[PDB]
Structures are given as C-alpha cells and as structure tokens.
Amino acid sequence: MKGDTKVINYLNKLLGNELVAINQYFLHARMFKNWGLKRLNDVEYHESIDEMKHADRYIERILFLEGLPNLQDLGKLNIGEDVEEMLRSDLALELDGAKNLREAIGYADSVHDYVSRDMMIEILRDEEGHIDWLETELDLIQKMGLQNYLQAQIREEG
Amino acid sequence: MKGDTKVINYLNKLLGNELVAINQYFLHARMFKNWGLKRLNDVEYHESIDEMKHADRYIERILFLEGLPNLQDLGKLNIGEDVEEMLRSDLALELDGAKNLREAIGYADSVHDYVSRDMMIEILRDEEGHIDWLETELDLIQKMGLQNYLQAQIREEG
Amino acid sequence: MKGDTKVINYLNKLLGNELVAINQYFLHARMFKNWGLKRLNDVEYHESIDEMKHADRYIERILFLEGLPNLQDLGKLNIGEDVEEMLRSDLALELDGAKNLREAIGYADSVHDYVSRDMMIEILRDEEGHIDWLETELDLIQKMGLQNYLQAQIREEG
Amino acid sequence: MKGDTKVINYLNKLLGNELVAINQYFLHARMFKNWGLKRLNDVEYHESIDEMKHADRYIERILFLEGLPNLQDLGKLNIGEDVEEMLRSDLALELDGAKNLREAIGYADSVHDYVSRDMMIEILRDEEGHIDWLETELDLIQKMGLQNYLQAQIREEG
Amino acid sequence: MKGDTKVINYLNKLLGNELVAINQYFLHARMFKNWGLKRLNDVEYHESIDEMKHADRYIERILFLEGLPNLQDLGKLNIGEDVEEMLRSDLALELDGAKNLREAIGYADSVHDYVSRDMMIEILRDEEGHIDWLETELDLIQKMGLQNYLQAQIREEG
Amino acid sequence: MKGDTKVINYLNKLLGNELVAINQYFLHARMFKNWGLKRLNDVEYHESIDEMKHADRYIERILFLEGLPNLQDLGKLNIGEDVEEMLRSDLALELDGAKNLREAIGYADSVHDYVSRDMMIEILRDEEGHIDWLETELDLIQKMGLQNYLQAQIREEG
Amino acid sequence: MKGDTKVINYLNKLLGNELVAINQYFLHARMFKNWGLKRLNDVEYHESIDEMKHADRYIERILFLEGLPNLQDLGKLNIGEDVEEMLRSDLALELDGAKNLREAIGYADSVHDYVSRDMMIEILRDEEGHIDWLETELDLIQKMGLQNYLQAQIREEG
C-alpha cells in the first residue's frame, strides 16, 4: 500500500536510530561480559535484541508501505571505555531517538497515517523503558559508589 | 448493632491513621521502586497492603456498629526525599498509631466493647511488627553505612 | 526523565480523581456488604481495586517523569444513604473524571507526551466501562423496581 | 449441476429472509446486552448465528445449482424499542419465513428437487424452534409481568 | 453515555462498510469453495468473520453511545466472476473503508472521543492486514501466472 | 414386511446402478494409483466405498421388504483411458443414477413407502456430492491445464 | 590476552563482512516475506541469524584478544529488486567473505594463533553451507523456470 513519502523518510530515520542502538548496545554488552559483569551483559544484550525487533518492525512497515528500508547508512557510535561512560552514551542515544519518534509521531498524525503512529508509540513506550533503566543505574553508581556497584554486576540476576 | 459513640469515634480516628499510612507507605514504595530498590519496594508495598486490610477491618466494624466510616478527612503525610528520612517518617507514623490504639483499647475495655478491643489488639500486634522492622532497618543503615545498605536493596529478597 | 510541568499537573489532578474514587467505591462496597447486597459488594469492590491500580499507574508515571505525586489532597466524597443515590454519586464522579482525562489527553498530545497520552487513553477505556455498568444498573432499578432489583443483589453472581 | 430456475429463485428469497433475520436478531441481541439482559443476549445471539448458518446452507446450494446468491437486496428490518416489541418483531419475521419455506418446499417437490426440499425441511424444523421459544417468552412476560420477567434476564442461564 | 452525533454518524458509516465486506467476503469465499479453491475459501471465510467482529464492535459502541446502529442500509456489492476480479473488488472495498476510517479517526480526535478513536485505530490495523494480503496475492497471480496460482489454492494451507 | 413390487423393482434398479459405480470407481481408482496419482486414488477409492455402502443399504431394504436383491445383472461400465475421460464417465454415470433416484423417490411417495423414500433421499444427497466434486474437478483441469492438474494429484491431500 | 595486531585486523575485517551479511540477508528476508515467499523468508532469516552469531563470535574473540571490535564501518550492501538478483548478491557476498577467511586463516597459522584459526575454520564451514544452498537455489530457478520456482516458495517448508 503506497505510503506518504515524508512518513517513509521518518521511518528510515527511526530505523537508522535502531541500527545504531543495536551495534552500540551489543558491543557494550560483550564488553561488560568481557569484564566479567554478567548482570550488565544480560541487560545490554536484552536491550540490544529489543532494538533488533524494533528495527524489524520498521523494515516491514516501510516495505509494506512500498518504500525502501535503509540499512546502508550507519550513524555514529559512541562506545566509551568505562561503565558509566557507556551507560551515559546509551542514555544520550536513547534520548535522541525518543526526540525523533515524537516528531515522527506528530507528523504521522497530521498525514493520517494512524497505523504507523500507533506502531511508533508502542516503540516509544519501550524506549522510555530503556531510558528509565539507564537513568536508574547511573543514579545508583553515584549513590553507592562504583566499587560496590560493580560488585553488584558480577552475578546474573535470577 | 448500636455501638458506643465514643468507641466509634476512636475507630474512625484509628481508621484515619490507616488511611495516612496507606498513602505514605504506597508512595514511599513506588519511590523506592523508581530508585531501583526492589527489596525496599516489596516491603513497603506489602506494609501498605496491610494498612489497607486494617482499614477494611475498621470500616466494616464501624458499619456493623451502625456508625459512619470517615474516609474524607486525610491526615498529614510526611514523605521524605531520602531512604532514611522515609523510614523515619513511617516509624514516627507507626509509633503515633500505636499510641492511639492503646488509648482506644483501654477505652473499649471500660465500655465493655470486647469484640472491638480484641480486633484492635490484633491490629496492634501487626503494627508492632511494622515497628520492629523499621527500627531494625534504621539500625542497619547506621551499622553498615548507607552505600552498603542501598546495595543490599537492589535485588528482591527471595 | 524530565517531563512537562503542565502534564505532571494533569497527572496529579487525575491521580486526585482516582484517590476519591478509591475511597467512595470502597465505602459504598462495604455499605452494600453491610446491607447484605453481596453482588453489589463484589462489583464495587472490584471497581475500587481498579481505581487503586489506575492510581498506581499515575504515581509511577509522575515519579518516572521526575515529578511529585500528590496523595495529600483529597477531594470531596459524596456517599449517599441509599443504593440509587450511591450509584448516582459514583456515576457523577466517573463522568467528571472522564471529562478531566479528555482534557489531559488532548494536552499531552500537543506537548508530544505520547506515552502519557496512551496510558490515559487506556485508563479512559476502563473508566467508560465503569460508566456503562453504572448507567445500566440505574436503568434496571427503574425498569424492575427497587424491591426486585435488591432481591437480585443478595447472592454473589457466579 | 444446473438447477430449476424457479427453485433457485425461491432459494434466494429464503436467503433474503435469513439475511434480514441475521441483522435483526444480532442487533436485538446487542441491545439486550447493552441493557444488561445477559440471558436474552445469549439467546438472540445464538439464534442470530443459526440464521447465519442457514444462510450459508442456502448460498452453497444456490452456487452448487449454478445459480447466483443474492446478498445485495436486504429486506425491511423491524427493530422495536422494547423487549416485547422486539420479540414480537422476531416472531412476525419467523412466521413469514416459515410461510415462504412451506411454499418453496411444496414447489421443490413438484419439480422433483428433493435434495433442496429436504434441506429446507431441516431449516424449517429449526425455524419452528425459534417460533416456540418466542411465543413461550411472550406468554411468560404476560404471565409474570414485565418486571419479574426482566429480573429473570439479567443473569446468564447456566 | 451520550456521544457526539457526528461521531455516531461516522460509526454507522463505518458499520455500513463492514456490512458490505461481510457479504462480499462471504460470497466470494463460498464461490472459491464451490470452485474447489480450499485455500482461498479458508482465507476469505476468515476475513469475512473478522468484518463480522468489527461490525459487532461498532454496533456495541454506537449502542453504548446511546445511538442507533444502522443495519438496514446496505451498500453496493461488487462480486466479480473470476479470482482476480474478486480479489481486486475486495481490495477496492478495503481501500475505501480505510479512507473512511482515517477521516473518522481524525474527527474523533478533534471531538475528544478518544475511546472511539482507539477502537477505530485497532480496526484500521486489521484492515491494513487485509490490504497487504490482497495485494500480495494479486502480485503473485501476475508473477507465477494464473494456472500455477490456482494450482496453489486447491489444498488447505496447514 | 411385504413391500410394493414396483418399489422393490426400483430398488433393484438403483442397486444395479450402484454395482456399476462400485466397479467403475474402483477400477478408475487403481488406474490412478497405478499412474501415481495418489490424491485421485484416495478420492475415487473413497467414492467407491460409498457406493458399496449404498448398495448394502439397498440390499438390506429389499430383503426386509421380502424381495430379491439382484446382484447378477451388471450394467455397462465405461472406463476411459485418460483422467478427464474417466471423470466424465463417472459424472455421466452419476447423473443417470440421480435421474433414476428422483423417479424412484416420486414413486415411493405415491405408494406411501415413506421409509424407502427417505432412504433414497439420503443416498441422493450423497450422489449429488459425488456430482459436485466431479464437475469441480473437470472445471479445474480446463482452468489450469492438464499438466498443472496432474502435478497436483501426485501427493495425497493431508 | 594480548593478541597479534595483524590478526585482530583480519578479525575486524571478517566482522565487517558479517555485519554486511546480517543487513543484506535480513532485508532480503523481509522483502521475500513482503512478497509472500514464506519459504524464502524463513531461509534468509535463519541465514541472517547465523551471521549475527558469527559476528558475536568475532566480537568476543577480538575483545578477549584485547582489541577493539569495529561495528562502525559498514560495507556496501547490494540488495537487488528480484529474487534471482538477490540470491546472486548474497552468493557474491559469501564468496568474497570465504576469500577473506582463507587469507585470515593462513595468516593466523603463521603467527601461531591456532585458537583463532580454528574458530574461523568453523565459521568457514558454515559459510560454505550458505554457498551450496545459494548455488543450488540459483540452479533450480534456471532448471524449472521462475514461475514454478516462485510457486514453490509460498508455503513454509515443514
């Protein structure tokens, strides 16, 4: 079904966001794993998979809309060589993505692409979940100090 | 069954106590949850529910006694913006409630409202449980430091 | 995540609505129970619990949004000393709440707080359920007369 | 298999009858449901589905007979704004349908379309079931009064 | 609960759309079945049932909104005497329905009938599913030719 | 129980029809099987068995009616050396049988042998099933071509 | 454990190969899915996941070797707007990857990085599997024609 060009563009933009998150989240995860921070690996890993699913949703939607998914262009990744830096990177990435989503959502509404709008709101709902988690962890680092915090990541959370 | 006016008054007073505890305990719980202190959330939550049950007991008793439950008037809540402050608030709230209970109990005895008396003693038994827990937790914060204590609240206690 | 001030205000307003419903619905329930109207007790009770859940959703959202939940200020409760009066009170309360919701929803949309918007729409969906139920019951009182209607409430609906 | 034109015509006529019943029965059902008359909703609903099945039988038979099912032309629906009026409408609708069936059956016999005849007799058997139920219900309203009758429709019949 | 007149009108319009789809989808299904195209029968049948459910949702909503469902007026059906023609008819019907939905949705938003809006978006979500399916099938007819395509419909898809 | 002579005669005539169908259907089946057309073998086989059952019904009825079943006289079989020819043979055979049935049925009615009549109508119901299937298959051969059609007969239809 | 720089470089190169395959394979998959070619979707999807796993193996190895995984730089993707073109693209991609692997393997051997060598040989073993499948499929398109081939991709292979 032919979709709005501007909409399809937003979709690809959003898809681009996910593609970046996938890679960042995944690398961070294995870095945590490499460092022996199992708890953190599990989390990041999971979040990474969620972005993979969000991306799949985007790709399928664009395709349905008879558009062309853009997986070629990859945005800048901001790794970080320490736990807090990494969490702060993700956070920043998430905040930006949310920013784009809200813009895209408002647009879909005006062009009456309600099915795309709803999809994005669902994804936004998820993103805000990643946001909360990341902020809460960052706050804990500060509250209990890094050494205790890291001690808390060595074992998998049952 | 027509009950003693003075008794029904004590009941409503006690009910008022519970109504305040419900809200305080519940807010504190979600605040802990928001902060990532699962263990603390679970506890506060549970205690909050206990208050809700106590209140139900009160409401039903007053109604049986052909009185009028008072849910309109809500006492002052003392939140607190930090773990210890919050626990200290609850503690203070609990101590006061107990104080009222003892007064109410002694009164019910004199007016021969033994069934109300026994109910209140049961509830008192519970409250003192809340008291012990609270004191114990406050003592622990002091004993191991806040950073270790907080670190201990992150995971739910299986 | 820092949220829109105006939004957080609406949230607390809505939370205030629920807090009132919780108390009204709960008292009415036990009043019905006291009167031997099991069917009615079960219903009101259930509805009361739903408002408790709606309130929890509000509290957590405000907290996430780095705002301050308001459980201190309690609106006016309108009890009623008879079945129909009570149902009419609830109805009125529900209608007002819905009115506020629609206002809040429209606002969240404009400020692009889509996740809050969606939450509220879900809650609205529920509220309208309470509305339908209450109207339908009120219509039946009139249609079969009070004596038959009350006869219909003595036993729990399987 | 090429069928008798006149027969196929009767079939479509009968199909038309069913199409009307489907809509009437279904609307009445939801109206009852809307009014809180569960027992009545269940019944009407069920009857509505039966009509849908009858229609399917008709459609398939006409098609087999290499004819053209007529779903375009919809007869007059007679709703009714009250329980008895609605039941009386259905009754009237059913009586007419039966009238047509008998005519169609007698005709199929003469043209030797025995397989169509038998099908219709089966359907007739069903319709007369709808008839009995309807009459019985109308008689009951009269016998116990509308208020008692309505009171009896609130709960689903286990 | 009294609803917006204009909204109720859109609802009935949408209901009218479904009523047409029900009949078209159902007839096409049995036509496919008559032709020995099981796979196609199953699909159309299923889709037909979905429109029946969508219609039920509409009817109940209008009723709740204290409006009058319109099942009397039936739109034009466009059958088609061949597989592709039939699929193209459905497609066209679906596209139009979606067109109406988007209009209705945008309107409900402005009048603040958020619960109706959300319902419609859900239904729209479904409709677009029918759309995708129908386009994909039409594309396959062209890609593998009719004779192979029909060969592919004789057996039920497990 | 002594039955009408003329009726018993029709019965034997009908029995004769079945005896021919049994042999034709069975031979065709194994021919299909021999050719590797499993799907077709299964079908023909099944149909062949149905004829066998029909015959049993006839034999038992005639015997009950104190008549003499005629299994000695076997009508002309029309095999055919190709799929379509075979299906066309069966079709012709079925059409004739139906023709006889209708005649027999009408007769049983006049002589008041209602139990025989009903039996025959049941059997007729079955035969028309064989008819539909046969026509449908012949239509498909034409529609998709013989090569695609044959390709579709190789595997058993699960 | 500090690893050979040149080795780590090969690893990242190989990782880069996988990153490209992930995206290409995944997009192709959903494109097939969008087109209704389930069988093809399942395959591509699976292959896409394999690439994801291979990449994970690479990332973890580089990290262990105290190197820096490179997920930022994404090679050129060659989509293709038709089934054969897509399969040919993948094939080409796979052939190149294998080419790099063999080079990397031979190198690891000389530098005595046997554990990396073995890992790569395992991955190579997998890739050659992807290769065979691809060639086989391309050969089949040619052998049976595209129309028959496509017809064979519609249903998932149980």
Ligand code: HEM
């Ligand atoms: C601060 C406002 C309140 C909040 C946020 C709240 C919240 C809750 C929640 C979330 C539940 C669990 C619901 C479920 O999962 O099914 C619950 C249960 C309950 N609440 Fe409340 N509540 C509040 C006030 C009250 C009041 C005033 C009463 C009246 C005494 C009350 C009585 C109850 C009862 C009887 C239960 C059921 C516990 C059980 O299952 O045994 N609540 N509440």
Ligand code: HEM
């Ligand atoms: C007034 C319009 C109609 C409405 C509102 C309606 C509604 C429904 C609903 C809600 C169901 C149950 C679906 C489920 O839960 O899976 C159903 C089933 C069904 N309907 Fe309809 N329908 C309508 C018209 C028709 C027509 C015209 C036909 C064609 C004869 C038809 C044929 C069927 C059939 C065959 C079933 C399946 C029953 C079974 O499971 O055996 N309906 N309908």
Ligand code: HEM
């Ligand atoms: C042309 C000669 C016939 C052949 C080659 C034939 C073949 C068969 C075969 C292979 C079976 C399945 C046996 C099994 O696997 O259990 C069967 C079943 C049967 N046959 Fe025949 N048959 C013939 C004639 C007849 C006749 C003349 C009758 C009498 C009416 C008859 C009545 C039956 C019955 C009642 C069954 C059991 C059906 C069931 O499974 O419920 N057959 N036949």
Ligand code: HEM
């Ligand atoms: C083109 C971008 C990508 C897409 C669209 C994508 C998509 C997916 C999807 C949909 C799943 C299944 C999720 C589930 O159902 O739970 C998955 C699994 C997975 N992905 Fe990705 N992915 C992409 C890139 C990557 C990358 C770069 C990596 C890093 C090497 C990766 C690693 C994984 C892993 C390890 C799994 C789990 C497989 C298992 O369960 O064993 N993915 N992917």
Ligand SMILES: [Fe+3]
């Ligand atoms: Fe995401």
Ligand SMILES: [Fe+3]
């Ligand atoms: Fe995210």
Ligand SMILES: [Fe+3]
């Ligand atoms: Fe208490």
Ligand SMILES: [Fe+3]
């Ligand atoms: Fe307490």
Ligand SMILES: [Fe+3]
């Ligand atoms: Fe609520």
Ligand SMILES: [Fe+3]
């Ligand atoms: Fe409510």
Ligand SMILES: [Fe+3]
């Ligand atoms: Fe009927």
Ligand SMILES: [Fe+3]
């Ligand atoms: Fe009927």
Ligand SMILES: [Fe+3]
């Ligand atoms: Fe629909």
Ligand SMILES: [Fe+3]
């Ligand atoms: Fe549709």
Ligand SMILES: [Fe+3]
């Ligand atoms: Fe037979």
Ligand SMILES: [Fe+3]
């Ligand atoms: Fe036969």
